């Protein structure tokens, strides 16, 4: 395999981390290939769940706990710390909140969160590589509690970063916030990509096409599929009680992605940097509730 940039996987991984049996598990946790039968049963359907009162409270809880875990990860971002170390802390933090780390064994994904450095777009596998000053790194967290998944991610600076990294990260966050600002009953899902691409393009950046936002609730990924790029053909209209993510991945160079031999790590084909931010959203009568909002600060970690 010809790698697209400087990053390489750093093996072996530590033995898979166990989740105590008292923590409730999603269907795929114990499937040999990590397949989710509940998800497969709805594969290719475009109908969107309207959450019940009980569902909304369940989503509120797991989304709050997921934010807590992302904040744990944020505190560990420094030169020399390996992404494996971040994942261990994350794994323990999920357990401490009586949650299952949703990525663990999801379609055999080996770790409990995704750590995406520099040219990795998404789905980076936590490994023995120490973070380097100048790096940017996304940590993507999803927790499962009482039948519900909650999903967020932020990109972080490792020590001092160059002006381009600052611009990419700032712009990506601005893309996310502009899209969220447009969310309310009656807006088409396909509209969000128009807003996101307009802003990214205005700042000399491109928009990943192969990976999208998604419905989430009792399933990790379900309808709607939410592309982040302009003139896309996403199906559906926002309604009060819909829950979904917006998680735009934006790139310094071209939009094209490819996957490492590990079957997971998505990287820019040109080896230039990519950044991502993600929230889980609940559509309300007036707009939307950001379920994964940071509670003790108005701003994401990179600003702070
Ligand atoms: C957005 C997304 N994320 C993850 C994932 C998987 C492991 C850890 C974190 N995230 N898995 C996903 N899909 C799991 C089912 N298999 C598929 C199907 C189509 C496309 C993909 C892929 F690889 F994400 F593009 N995976 C998706 Cl759609
Ligand atoms: Co994912
Ligand atoms: Co995520
Ligand atoms: Co997501
Ligand atoms: K990245």
UniProtKB/Swiss-Prot annotation:
Recorded catalytic reaction(s): these are: Release of N-terminal amino acids, preferentially methionine, from peptides and arylamides
Describe how the cofactor binds.
Binds 2 divalent metal cations per subunit. Has a high-affinity and a low affinity metal-binding site. The true nature of the physiological cofactor is under debate. The enzyme is active with zinc, cobalt, manganese or divalent iron ions. Has high activity with zinc; zinc cofactor is transferred into the active site region by the ZNG1 zinc chaperone.
Instruction: Summarize where a protein binds, as residue positions.
Output: 123, 221
Q: Name one GO cellular component term.
A: cytosolic ribosome
Is RNA-binding among this UniProt entry's keywords? no
Alphabetized, the UniProt keywords read:
Acetylation, Aminopeptidase, Cytoplasm, Hydrolase, Metal-binding, Protease, Zinc, Zinc-finger
Q: What is this protein called?
A: Methionine aminopeptidase 1
Organism annotation: Homo sapiens
């Amino acid at each position: 395999y010809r790698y697209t940039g400087k990053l390489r996987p750093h093996y072996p991984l530590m033995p898979t981390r166990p989740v105590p049996s008292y923590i409730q598990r999603p269907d795929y946790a114990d499937h040999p290939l990590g397949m989710s039968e509940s998800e497969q049963a709805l594969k290719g359907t475009s109908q969107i769940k309207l959450l019940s009162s009980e569902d909304i409270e369940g989503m509120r809880l797991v989304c709050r706990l997921a934010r807590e875990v992302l904040d744990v990860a944020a505190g560990m971002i420094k030169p020399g710390v390996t992404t494996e170390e971040i994942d261990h802390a994350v794994h323990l933090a999920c357990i401490a909140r009586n949650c299952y780390p949703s990525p663990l064994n999801y379609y055999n994904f080996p770790k409990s969160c995704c750590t995406s450095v520099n040219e990795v777009i998404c789905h980076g596998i936590p490994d023995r590589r120490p973070l380097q000053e100048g790096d940017i790194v996304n940590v993507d967290i999803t927790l499962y509690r009482n039948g519900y998944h909650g999903d967020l991610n932020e990109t972080f600076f490792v020590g001092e970063v160059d002006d381009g990294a600052r611009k990419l990260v700032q712009t990506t966050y601005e893309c996310l916030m502009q899209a969220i600002d447009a969310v309310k009953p009656g807006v088409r899902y396909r509209e969000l990509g128009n807003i996101i691409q307009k802003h990214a393009q205005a700042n000399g950046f491109s928009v990943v096409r192969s990976y999208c936002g998604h419905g989430i609730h009792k399933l990790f990924h379900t309808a709607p599929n939410v592309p982040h790029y302009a003139k896309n053909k996403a199906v559906g209209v926002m309604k009060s009680g819909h829950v979904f993510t917006i998680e735009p991945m934006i790139c310094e160079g071209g939009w094209q992605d490819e996957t490492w031999p590990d079957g997971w790590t998505a990287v820019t084909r040109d080896g230039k940097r990519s950044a991502q931010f993600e929230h889980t959203l609940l559509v309300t009568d007036t707009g939307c509730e950001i379920l994964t909002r940071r509670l003790d600060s108005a701003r994401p970690h990179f600003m702070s």
